Protein backbone atom coordinates (compact mmCIF):
# COMPACT_ATOMS: atom_id res chain seq x y z
CA UNK A 1 0.00 0.00 0.00
CA UNK A 2 2.82 2.38 -0.85
CA UNK A 3 1.83 4.89 -2.89
CA UNK A 4 4.22 3.91 -6.31
CA UNK A 5 4.77 7.44 -7.61
CA UNK A 6 6.06 8.67 -4.28
CA UNK A 7 8.75 5.95 -3.48
CA UNK A 8 9.38 5.70 -7.76
CA UNK A 9 10.81 9.57 -7.08
CA UNK A 10 12.95 8.49 -3.85
CA UNK A 11 14.40 5.91 -5.52
CA UNK A 12 15.17 8.13 -8.53
CA UNK A 13 17.00 10.42 -5.94
CA UNK A 14 18.94 7.90 -4.02
CA UNK A 15 20.28 6.54 -7.39
CA UNK A 16 21.08 10.12 -8.73
CA UNK A 17 22.93 10.60 -5.21
CA UNK A 18 24.88 7.44 -5.38
CA UNK A 19 26.20 8.66 -8.67
CA UNK A 20 26.90 12.18 -8.15
CA UNK A 21 29.03 11.47 -4.69
CA UNK A 22 31.17 8.37 -6.96
CA UNK A 23 31.84 10.81 -9.63
CA UNK A 24 33.15 13.82 -7.26
CA UNK A 25 34.21 11.71 -4.59
CA UNK A 26 36.73 10.09 -7.59
CA UNK A 27 36.95 13.65 -8.57
CA UNK A 28 38.67 14.84 -5.14
CA UNK A 29 41.05 12.23 -5.16
CA UNK A 30 42.00 11.95 -8.55
CA UNK A 31 43.45 15.88 -7.44
CA UNK A 32 44.55 14.98 -4.10
CA UNK A 33 46.81 11.94 -5.84
CA UNK A 34 48.10 14.82 -8.40
CA UNK A 35 48.92 17.73 -5.47
CA UNK A 36 52.53 17.26 -5.32
CA UNK A 37 53.55 19.94 -3.02
CA UNK A 38 51.90 18.98 0.00
CA UNK A 39 53.99 16.62 1.65
CA UNK A 40 53.96 16.29 5.47
CA UNK A 41 52.48 14.69 8.08
CA UNK A 42 48.96 16.30 8.01
CA UNK A 43 48.88 15.21 3.92
CA UNK A 44 49.42 11.50 5.22
CA UNK A 45 46.94 11.83 8.41
CA UNK A 46 44.34 13.20 5.00
CA UNK A 47 45.08 10.59 3.02
CA UNK A 48 43.45 8.16 5.82
CA UNK A 49 40.42 10.38 5.93
CA UNK A 50 39.72 10.21 2.09
CA UNK A 51 40.28 6.52 2.35
CA UNK A 52 37.67 5.67 5.17
CA UNK A 53 35.38 8.35 2.91
CA UNK A 54 35.76 5.93 0.11
CA UNK A 55 35.01 3.16 2.38
CA UNK A 56 32.01 4.48 3.55
CA UNK A 57 30.96 5.28 0.61
CA UNK A 58 31.17 1.37 -0.77
CA UNK A 59 29.24 0.53 1.88
CA UNK A 60 26.73 2.98 1.46
CA UNK A 61 26.80 2.07 -2.20
CA UNK A 62 25.91 -1.53 -1.68
CA UNK A 63 23.43 -0.92 1.37
CA UNK A 64 21.31 1.80 -1.49
CA UNK A 65 21.69 -0.35 -4.24
CA UNK A 66 20.13 -3.56 -2.18
CA UNK A 67 17.29 -1.03 -1.46
CA UNK A 68 16.88 0.16 -5.03
CA UNK A 69 16.50 -3.43 -6.75
CA UNK A 70 13.76 -4.30 -3.93
CA UNK A 71 12.04 -1.25 -4.00
CA UNK A 72 12.30 -1.01 -8.33
CA UNK A 73 10.94 -4.53 -8.26
CA UNK A 74 8.43 -4.24 -5.29
CA UNK A 75 6.86 -1.22 -7.24
CA UNK A 76 6.36 -3.21 -9.81
CA UNK A 77 4.58 -5.90 -7.84
CA UNK A 78 2.01 -3.01 -6.76
CA UNK A 79 1.56 -1.49 -10.05
CA UNK A 80 0.91 -4.73 -11.55
CA UNK A 81 -1.36 -5.47 -8.77
CA UNK A 82 -3.36 -2.24 -9.04
CA UNK A 83 -4.45 -2.41 -12.25
CA UNK A 84 -4.94 -5.65 -12.32
CA UNK B 1 57.94 23.42 -0.21
CA UNK B 2 54.37 24.24 -0.97
CA UNK B 3 53.49 25.61 -4.04
CA UNK B 4 50.74 27.73 -2.70
CA UNK B 5 48.58 28.30 -5.91
CA UNK B 6 48.58 24.49 -6.12
CA UNK B 7 47.11 24.08 -2.60
CA UNK B 8 45.37 26.91 -2.83
CA UNK B 9 43.23 25.19 -5.83
CA UNK B 10 43.20 22.29 -3.69
CA UNK B 11 41.56 23.85 -0.53
CA UNK B 12 39.04 25.41 -3.16
CA UNK B 13 38.17 21.87 -4.08
CA UNK B 14 38.03 20.13 -0.84
CA UNK B 15 35.96 23.52 -0.03
CA UNK B 16 33.38 22.95 -2.49
CA UNK B 17 33.27 19.08 -1.98
CA UNK B 18 32.68 19.32 2.08
CA UNK B 19 29.37 21.38 1.19
CA UNK B 20 28.18 19.51 -1.62
CA UNK B 21 28.63 16.39 0.71
CA UNK B 22 26.61 18.34 3.17
CA UNK B 23 23.96 19.48 1.09
CA UNK B 24 23.46 16.09 -0.88
CA UNK B 25 23.14 13.91 2.47
CA UNK B 26 20.43 16.35 4.07
CA UNK B 27 18.49 16.67 0.52
CA UNK B 28 18.37 12.94 0.59
CA UNK B 29 17.72 12.44 4.29
CA UNK B 30 14.95 15.19 4.19
CA UNK B 31 13.40 13.19 1.26
CA UNK B 32 13.44 9.86 3.12
CA UNK B 33 11.84 11.60 5.94
CA UNK B 34 9.20 12.86 4.19
CA UNK B 35 8.00 9.62 2.28
CA UNK B 36 4.29 8.96 3.70
CA UNK B 37 3.96 5.17 1.92
CA UNK B 38 7.37 3.39 2.60
CA UNK B 39 6.37 2.07 6.56
CA UNK B 40 8.67 -1.81 6.71
CA UNK B 41 11.29 -3.15 8.37
CA UNK B 42 13.30 -2.51 5.05
CA UNK B 43 12.55 1.31 5.66
CA UNK B 44 13.43 1.01 9.44
CA UNK B 45 16.74 -0.27 8.45
CA UNK B 46 17.18 2.28 6.26
CA UNK B 47 16.48 4.26 8.25
CA UNK B 48 18.90 3.65 10.47
CA UNK B 49 21.70 3.59 7.40
CA UNK B 50 20.81 6.81 6.44
CA UNK B 51 21.35 8.13 10.07
CA UNK B 52 24.99 6.54 9.92
CA UNK B 53 25.82 8.08 6.66
CA UNK B 54 25.26 11.55 8.08
CA UNK B 55 27.18 10.81 11.25
CA UNK B 56 30.45 9.54 9.56
CA UNK B 57 29.77 12.30 6.37
CA UNK B 58 29.45 14.47 9.86
CA UNK B 59 33.19 13.19 11.12
CA UNK B 60 34.48 13.90 7.44
CA UNK B 61 32.90 17.54 7.28
CA UNK B 62 35.16 18.12 10.80
CA UNK B 63 37.98 16.52 9.53
CA UNK B 64 37.68 18.27 6.00
CA UNK B 65 37.09 21.41 7.78
CA UNK B 66 39.99 21.63 9.81
CA UNK B 67 42.31 20.47 7.04
CA UNK B 68 40.79 23.40 5.20
CA UNK B 69 42.07 25.92 8.43
CA UNK B 70 45.16 24.39 8.68
CA UNK B 71 46.35 24.77 5.27
CA UNK B 72 45.30 27.92 4.65
CA UNK B 73 46.87 29.31 7.45
CA UNK B 74 50.23 27.48 6.61
CA UNK B 75 49.73 29.31 3.15
CA UNK B 76 49.65 32.53 4.89
CA UNK B 77 52.33 31.86 6.96
CA UNK B 78 54.53 30.81 4.21
CA UNK B 79 53.89 33.32 2.23
CA UNK B 80 54.55 36.15 4.90
CA UNK B 81 58.03 34.14 5.32
CA UNK B 82 58.28 34.87 1.81
CA UNK B 83 57.90 38.24 1.83
CA UNK B 84 60.32 38.31 5.46
CA UNK B 85 62.66 36.80 2.96
CA UNK B 86 63.17 39.51 0.97
CA UNK B 87 63.19 42.00 3.47
Known amino acids: QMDTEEVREFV ?3 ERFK ?3 REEVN ?3 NHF ?3 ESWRD ?3 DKFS ?9 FNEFDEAAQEQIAWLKERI ?6 YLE
Open 27 to 29: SLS
Open 12 to 14: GHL
Open 19 to 21: ELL
Open 41 to 43: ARR
Open 48 to 56: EVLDNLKST
Open 33 to 35: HNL
Open 76 to 81: RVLEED
